[PDB]
Design a binder for this molecule. Structure first.
Ligand SMILES: CC[C@@H](C)C[C@@H](CC)C(C)C
Length: 146
């Protein structure tokens, strides 16, 4: 009853390898490119670009500052995908678990997926994070377009 999945897909005209590796090896540069959305990315454990690294994101939605600590649980170079599992922060006021994945198909299409389990049934499905992820994707595309 508590489980759901949200997905957004959109095209980018910028390079899809550069987009993938932004999130896979350079996530700490994301705040510099989309500062209205994401104000910080600090390495908590491990190393950038390695499975099992843990980062702390400082981000904002509708003018409200929030924090998410995430474990990078998968980086698939072949599929051009990165998966971030939330382990602490604001989102744990609503969810038991929530996982973000970003995939790039370069035959370019960026797909964001949100997999989640709500603490209880009155919790809203986190659709607002799709608007957030589309905004971050559009700022990255604009930055990467020469
Ligand atoms: C939890 C909200 C933001 C900081 C999400 C991040 C995806 C896991 C970010 C890299 C877009």
């Amino acid at each position: 009853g508590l489980t759901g999945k949200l997905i957004c897909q959109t095209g980018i005209k910028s390079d899809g390898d550069v987009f993938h590796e932004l999130f896979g090896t350079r996530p700490h540069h994301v705040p510099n490119i989309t500062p209205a959305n994401i104000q910080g990315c600090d390495l908590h454990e491990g190393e950038f670009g390695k499975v099992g690294s843990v980062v702390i994101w400082n981000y904002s939605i509708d003018g409200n500052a929030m924090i998410a600590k995430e474990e990078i649980v998968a980086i698939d170079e072949e599929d051009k995908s990165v998966t971030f599992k939330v382990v602490e922060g604001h989102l744990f006021e609503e969810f038991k678990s929530i996982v973000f994945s970003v995939h790039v198909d370069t035959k370019n299409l960026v797909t964001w997926s949100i997999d989640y389990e709500k603490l209880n049934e009155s919790v809203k499905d986190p659709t607002s994070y799709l608007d957030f992820l589309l905004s971050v994707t559009r700022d990255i595309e604009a930055h990467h377009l020469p």
